[PDB]
Amino acid sequence: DYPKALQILTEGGTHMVCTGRTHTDRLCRFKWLCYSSEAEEFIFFHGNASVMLPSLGSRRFQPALLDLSTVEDHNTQYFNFVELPAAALRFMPKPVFVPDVALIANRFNPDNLMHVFHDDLLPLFYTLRQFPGLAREARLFFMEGWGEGAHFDLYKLLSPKQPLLRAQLKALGRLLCFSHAFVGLSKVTTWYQYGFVQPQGPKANILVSGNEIRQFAHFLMEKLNVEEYILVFSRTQNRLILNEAELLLALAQEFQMKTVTVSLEDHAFADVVRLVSNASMLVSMHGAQLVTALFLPRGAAVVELFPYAVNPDHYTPYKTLATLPGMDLQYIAWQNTMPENTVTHPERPWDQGGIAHLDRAEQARILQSREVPRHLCCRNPEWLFRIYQDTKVDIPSLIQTIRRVVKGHPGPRKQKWTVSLYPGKVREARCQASVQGASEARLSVSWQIPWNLKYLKVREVKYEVWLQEQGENTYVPYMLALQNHTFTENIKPFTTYLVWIRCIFNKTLLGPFADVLVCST
Amino acid sequence: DYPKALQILTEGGTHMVCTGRTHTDRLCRFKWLCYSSEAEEFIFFHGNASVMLPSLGSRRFQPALLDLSTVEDHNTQYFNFVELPAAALRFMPKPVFVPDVALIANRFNPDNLMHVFHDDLLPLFYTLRQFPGLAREARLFFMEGWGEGAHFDLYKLLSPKQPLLRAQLKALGRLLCFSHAFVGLSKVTTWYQYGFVQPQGPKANILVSGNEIRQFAHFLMEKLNVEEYILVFSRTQNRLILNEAELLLALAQEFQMKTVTVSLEDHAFADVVRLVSNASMLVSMHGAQLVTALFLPRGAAVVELFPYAVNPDHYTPYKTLATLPGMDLQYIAWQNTMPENTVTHPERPWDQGGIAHLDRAEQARILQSREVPRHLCCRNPEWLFRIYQDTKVDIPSLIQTIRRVVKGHPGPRKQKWTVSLYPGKVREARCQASVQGASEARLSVSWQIPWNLKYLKVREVKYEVWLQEQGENTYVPYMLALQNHTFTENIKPFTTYLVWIRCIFNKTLLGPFADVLVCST
Ligand SMILES: O=c1ccn([C@@H]2O[C@H](COP(=O)(O)OP(=O)(O)O)[C@@H](O)[C@H]2O)c(=O)[nH]1
Ligand SMILES: O=c1ccn([C@@H]2O[C@H](COP(=O)(O)OP(=O)(O)O)[C@@H](O)[C@H]2O)c(=O)[nH]1
Ligand SMILES: *[C@@H]1O[C@H](CO)[C@@H](O)[C@H](O)[C@H]1NC(C)=O
Ligand SMILES: *[C@@H]1O[C@H](CO)[C@@H](O)[C@H](O)[C@H]1NC(C)=O
């Protein structure tokens, strides 16, 4: 089928259809997109059937077409192509067509378990499911330029076909052309930004809940082929817990439960997931391994430990994950506040912390500072100094800190979890008015229950009625339990009121407002 | 199939994956989404495999999940669903599973030709091509509630399956369930906003060029199975050119060859497209019929006539279409300034203008204003009254206006049109410095051509070099013809200079900057 594919490519050229009005929110569908392995450049070939949506002109370099990773607007993770006429193929090597449909993306840091899960694995899972056929047919192409990395077998779980690295493309041919390729990863599952513009923290508008996290974790547990106990997630190289043996005995005594230790180094990852998946409580130093908390059962507790001078309020990727609506996880943060219990490593090279390379004046300033100031990514000297300390955990202060959230037995001790759904609009809202005196009037409002309430058993159903006089800039709310109400002493005669009605399930599930009612007295 | 389909729906529930961080930029892929034809509500069933991305909570009602039409954030064009547990299906009739994969959207105004093409046809065409398999296997579901409309056969040209309107779903069953549904329309092909928040005009950031318009027009011409001349697009019901015959011979006299006439009422649309298809020039009054200028051949001229009191620059849906990059059309506008040559109809009813039913004082102001003021959409009596008046075109005034833009014979003749593409980054930029004294210093820069230029012949190739002293907030640019240069004047010794390089094709095709060059002197 090569002469037919070469003919379509040489006559018609590249076809590009993309979602999104900005580059930070863009997914592209390509046909006959090409790639030079010598230049490491993707190629758009203009032919007689070529389409480019969006067609940006020179705005395609301000800054680029789309983000290749899920890190927003990272200036080393952009995607773009160079343009050529389809006829320019007459002067080029013969193209080598890739048969598989491709999903093209960059992995932001395939060596960090948190980056792997939050930036790549979750977005890959749902970007594949954004388009029909991808989840079963797509071969992934990782174009960021790093090797396999320490977690490459995790990437292999998301696709049935072996992923390809950019370095592997040059052995496939000098000119490669994808008959069908998707480019980009959706940011819909992300919950954290790493501090390039403003200091790191939760992303402003999180669009993912624990249910979608757990559906992903359920898929990975099946692909990994996966009595109550507390689990301590230790580190063996750096950011250590120095009194680990004392911590395990105390936790076992405080909660009357078995306490088990796991680490990324000494256990196959399937066994790591298996241990986490049935743990009533996860205790761990702040670090990449804590992203595995997404495998915790609903109702379990996350106990995150922070080293000296590291404010837990400033470094919240795992707090944000654990407290996502729908995750149903308890979050406890503990910070070492005793300098005699921290171990400093200042004679390390700058990469691993250590401050010996800076002048003596800044070294004293760092050692005296009892809290890492707010900073931007990525190599702030003080932050790396403190975040790579060793920590002796003060047991009694940790136990009292945990007991402020977990007041009884930790874990999912026979608790049930509803699904949280919202009401519809109330239907057929009406109103009537009457006047009994120069200053006495009545305004009655009535409505039918939301349609989905006919098939719902809700513990508490209320209606909020917003009342506003026509000229006023104000509205007054009223909470009612019946489907009707007659306003009396708040109503003026010979005037007009606007009425908005919405239904509220329990107390926090706010429904939508119906069409406004105009009611004149 | 059906018993396996019902068990997936009742156990698993609805699955939803959507692009975009806002409702105004969102397309949704649904599996096991349902519709109650009685309540006229879509239903998300919560089951043990349900996915909701984005998961907005009550912000799903602020204001909705997505725009169902392409008119951004319109009050009455929102899409949403009501939520129910998957177990509720036991209390409903057995569902009717829609076989075909669906694309669900709202037509904004199926009775207006401009709205049909701009808001519906073009977005439908590329939204279908955004997702694999949609263009061949999808059935269109129009939920806005209108009937077929005046142009329903145009809609049927975009799908091999007969589209269904909302009113027909009640006959299919009380509860309808889509195994695979897509919801929403891309806005990437839009170029005009009709004036709901600010006076009407072109959309701010147009993402579509004339190429994608012509690829769409080439498709309709095939499905419609479609001696140089000038074409006058006539109106026969309202907003008519009174002196059609006088105008018609004048263009024959002032230019070269025939000037014929065409009308939406008296030809089949296939003949209307065919006559516009080979028209060297199209003259017409402002109206929906002018949207057919997208079928004009490369190089034609569009002459739009405006009633006496309407500003040509205040209403530019077809000026924006004609002057789109890649359309390669000349645009000519003419406004009637001689008030003797306009006749008006003050006592036609609400929908076709007239100072009827308005205050006599409000009349006089409309009687007096020589210019309809800038206004918000859908209600201005002066705009309607002044736009539905018939005009005697002053041939002397208009022929001058065309001759300013059309210097000789109108139409393409046999002009050349080549695709305008942009340079790649310059490759392997280098610098070296020299110091001749404590005030003199020489900075040399060199680079290789952009990779795609190795397969291009370009008339003018230039390079712009930006020099910034590190730490300073200023820069000086240099336009150069060679791939190397030695800077001398104003170069400070013992400094660090930041060097940016980009290539430019034919003055106006600005390419991207390469990675910054750090140069120490
Ligand atoms: O003692 C250690 C230190 C690190 N890592 C892993 O090695 C990677 C890099 O660790 P780093 O400290 O850079 O990440 P952080 O924990 O600060 O997110 C991550 O996947 C860690 O889980 C580990 O397994 N043991
Ligand atoms: O004399 C007329 C007036 C209108 N229309 C068509 O009827 C619809 C409504 O036109 P209207 O005047 O309401 O809007 P406008 O033409 O200003 O866009 C459009 O498809 C017009 O092309 C037509 O064919 N002839
Ligand atoms: C492009 O070229 C092919 C081959 O000649 C032809 O079939 C097709 O109609 C041309 N135009 C488009 C828009 O594809
Ligand atoms: C008001 O609503 C309640 C239920 O909420 C109903 O029992 C009662 O009959 C209603 N009254 C009127 C007048 O509609």
Ligand SMILES: *[C@@H]1O[C@H](CO)[C@@H](O)[C@H](O)[C@H]1NC(C)=O
């Ligand atoms: C949903 O439940 C069915 C049986 O009711 C089971 O086979 C399936 O694995 C479950 N899926 C998930 C994601 O829990």
Ligand SMILES: *[C@@H]1O[C@H](CO)[C@@H](O)[C@H](O)[C@H]1NC(C)=O
């Ligand atoms: C500079 O660039 C030109 C091409 O523009 C090239 O011919 C020449 O060899 C380069 N080097 C010098 C020293 O001119």
